[PDB]
Design a protein around this ligand. Structure first.
Ligand SMILES: Nc1ccn([C@H]2C[C@H](O)[C@@H](COP(=O)(O)OP(=O)(O)OP(=O)(O)O)O2)c(=O)n1
Ligand SMILES: [Mg+2]
Ligand SMILES: [Mn+2]
Ligand SMILES: [Mn+2]
Length: 327
């Protein structure tokens, strides 16, 4: 027959072969399964939404297809059979993008050895290399749950009524989580301040937190810690952990943003701008007032959002349970 998506299929085929011979035959199935669906398609796929609707392609496969599509250019060097398996090897290193991967490829790096030994490495990328095998795998939902309770009970020792919620893939009801994003705040809006610094070292001492990506990131009034953790006991693997501390005022919108999905967020922002608003991770606020000619005449004000439901209300949307916002 005739295959419209020739470009996507060739890369996915070389990609699938590499994974089966490298040990993962589960994912090579996903690529192979995806390839058959792609071949039997009337038109060339060039977008995310279109890739998701196709029978046989999941919403985590679509993101992978998009990555390949966006990073196609230049594809000038060598051939796909020798480049792509090496490109993916560097791509899966944490804190390394496709551009950083092909960059290392241009320099002449073919193994993870060459990356560690010679290549320039971010403070982030170094950590990924150390825990690369463990970072290649998603974690079961149950493992994410006891990580949630670990951070939760560790923080609640400081403040009894302190609230900790997992907003990653976990909250969306996903069966597997690449990482676990823990959001922490307090109902009064008073208690959350200062907890961040005195909790990290508390968790670091017990051997729970192994490495730190960013010691502390200050965005507005939000605190973010990117890092790595390992559960106690034998046979435990290292899981990347993201902690975000927000004021209770921004909690509803921070909850919604971090909850997901990524494409859901993008769709929410796109919808918010059509109703004359803007949806950040801080608060749902009215869009900047502009005259007819597009000149910025007025500042946008912040709307009060105490609950996650009120955000949906103000956007004229019927509420959607986290399981139903996995786009
Ligand atoms: N470019 C991005 C990345 C993330 N997020 C938001 C939505 C995500 O759900 C959330 C957490 O980021 P993750 O990288 O952890 O995404 P997921 O948890 O949903 O998937 P994964 O299982 O790989 O962690 O942050 C976003 O809005 N835009
Ligand atoms: Mg997550
Ligand atoms: Mn990566
Ligand atoms: Mn994350």
């Amino acid at each position: 027959a005739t295959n419209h998506n020739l470009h996507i299929t060739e890369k996915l085929e070389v990609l699938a072969k590499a994974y089966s011979v490298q040990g993962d035959k589960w994912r090579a199935l996903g690529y192979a399964k995806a390839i058959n669906a792609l071949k039997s398609f009337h038109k060339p796929v060039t977008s995310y939404q279109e890739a998701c609707s196709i029978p046989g392609i999941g919403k985590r496969m679509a993101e992978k297809i998009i990555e390949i599509l966006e990073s196609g250019h230049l594809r000038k060097l060598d051939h796909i059979s020798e480049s792509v398996p090496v490109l993916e090897l560097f791509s899966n290193i944490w804190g390394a993008g496709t551009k950083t991967a092909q960059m290392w490829y241009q320099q002449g790096f073919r193994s993870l050895e060459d990356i560690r030994s010679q290549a320039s490495l971010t403070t982030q990328q170094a950590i990924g290399l150390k825990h690369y095998s463990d970072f290649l795998e998603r974690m079961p939902r149950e493992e994410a749950t006891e990580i949630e309770q670990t951070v939760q009970k560790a923080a609640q020792a400081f403040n009894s009524g302190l609230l900790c919620v997992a907003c990653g893939s976990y909250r969306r009801g996903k069966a597997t989580c690449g990482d676990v994003d823990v959001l922490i705040t307090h109902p009064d809006g008073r208690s959350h301040r200062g907890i961040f610094s005195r909790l990290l070292d508390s968790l670091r001492q017990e051997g729970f937190l192994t490495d730190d990506l960013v010691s502390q990131e200050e965005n507005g009034q939000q605190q973010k810690y990117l890092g790595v953790c390992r559960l106690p006991g034998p046979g435990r693997r290292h899981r990347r952990l993201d902690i975000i501390v927000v004021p209770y005022s921004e909690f509803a919108c921070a909850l919604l943003y971090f909850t997901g999905s990524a494409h859901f967020n993008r769709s929410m922002r796109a919808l918010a701008k059509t109703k004359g608003m803007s949806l950040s991770e801080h608060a749902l606020s009215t869009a900047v007032v502009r005259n007819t000619h597009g000149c910025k005449v007025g500042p946008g004000r912040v709307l009060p959002t105490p609950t996650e439901k009120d955000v949906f209300r103000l956007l004229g949307l019927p509420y959607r349970e986290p399981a139903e916002r996995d786009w």
